Design a protein around this ligand. Structure first.
Ligand code: NA
Ligand code: NA
Ligand code: NA
Ligand code: NA
Ligand code: NA
Ligand SMILES: [Zn+2]
Length: 317
């Protein structure tokens, strides 16, 4: 007798494993729909005896599987799982060296922006509400980051090799972060329209676009008003474990002890390369696999991260 059937497990979350008896005369596709083995699309291949007892990813095809997928990924986007697997097939071959005490990514497939994201996340006090992200994030911190990178790609709607952006990626990722108690209060004054207090929460409480300087947001920054004038606003109150300050790329000085980490961007509207700036015993520039220690830094910066707990203004009235 030749082996005609094998037992395997199918899953959408790598946690709930569903026993299957597989017919070796049919493709995985014919039995399960689109099917993946460690990210590789095996929809078109027939089973092998060596597949016995292995775990295969499938698409959610009934209410139970859809529920398991939503519970794990916190999205109902039907294309997500396939995009995640497509990315994973490539990110499993990336290398994740320890550089300046953090898990970085050797350069591959235009992944500089993702390396800068990964490096930043390891320094923020953040957690993810989506179990897929939180579990992968834990493993990434230790050097096992292939899965986390594939997820970031999928959550970002980026494919492997696609040119990316740190701020855009952070916007997508932070939608799944623990930011429900993040709060920002801004005092806004227009000379024509008058005064108002704006309260922002969640992602909008921690991301700002217009200045790299947390000090400037505290003391006053120009902001367009609906009337066509430039109004001024400053930070009254901040409750979050960090803030991310962004601005169109320009030369900026970074001083150890005055920020947590940052993204350098060498380039312009067309093209650019993203490197990570942090500090340990001195300033560190981490460009994939490559470290440069620095005693000072003035360079082209687009995003600066700062630690926070709770801040209240000392500006009166
Ligand atoms: Na995961
Ligand atoms: Na901010
Ligand atoms: Na202030
Ligand atoms: Na960064
Ligand atoms: Na990097
Ligand atoms: Zn106005």
């Amino acid at each position: 007798m030749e082996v005609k059937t094998i037992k395997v497990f199918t899953t959408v979350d790598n946690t709930n494993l569903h026993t299957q008896l597989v017919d070796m005369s049919m493709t995985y596709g014919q039995q399960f729909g689109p099917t993946y083995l460690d990210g590789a699309d095996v929809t078109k291949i027939k089973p092998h005896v060596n597949h016995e007892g292995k775990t295969f990813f499938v698409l959610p095809s009934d209410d139970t599987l859809r529920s398991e997928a939503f519970e794990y990924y916190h999205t109902l986007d039907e294309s997500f799982l396939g995009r995640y697997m497509s990315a994973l097939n490539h990110t499993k071959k990336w290398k994740f060296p320890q550089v300046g005490g953090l898990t970085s990514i050797k350069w591959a497939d235009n992944n500089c922006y993702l390396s800068s994201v990964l490096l930043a996340l390891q320094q923020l006090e953040v957690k993810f509400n989506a179990p897929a992200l939180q579990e992968a994030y834990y493993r990434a911190r230790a050097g096992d980051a292939a899965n986390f990178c594939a997820l970031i790609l999928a959550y970002s709607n980026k494919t492997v090799g696609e040119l990316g952006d740190v701020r855009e990626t952070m916007t997508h990722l932070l939608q799944h972060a623990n930011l429900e108690s993040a709060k920002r209060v801004l005092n806004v004054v227009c000379k024509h329209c008058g005064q108002k207090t704006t309260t922002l929460t969640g992602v909008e409480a921690v991301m700002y676009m217009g200045t790299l300087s947390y000090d400037n947001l505290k003391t006053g920054v120009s902001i367009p008003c609906v009337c066509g004038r430039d109004a001024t606003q400053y930070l009254v109150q901040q409750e979050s474990s960090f803030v991310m300050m962004s601005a169109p790329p320009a030369e900026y000085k970074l001083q150890q002890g005055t920020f947590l980490c940052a993204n350098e961007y060498t380039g312009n509207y067309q093209c650019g390369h993203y490197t990570h700036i942090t500090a340990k015993e001195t300033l560190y520039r981490i460009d994939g696999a490559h470290l440069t220690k620095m005693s000072e830094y003035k360079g082209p910066v687009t995003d600066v991260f700062y630690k926070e707990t709770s801040y209240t203004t000392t500006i009166l009235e």
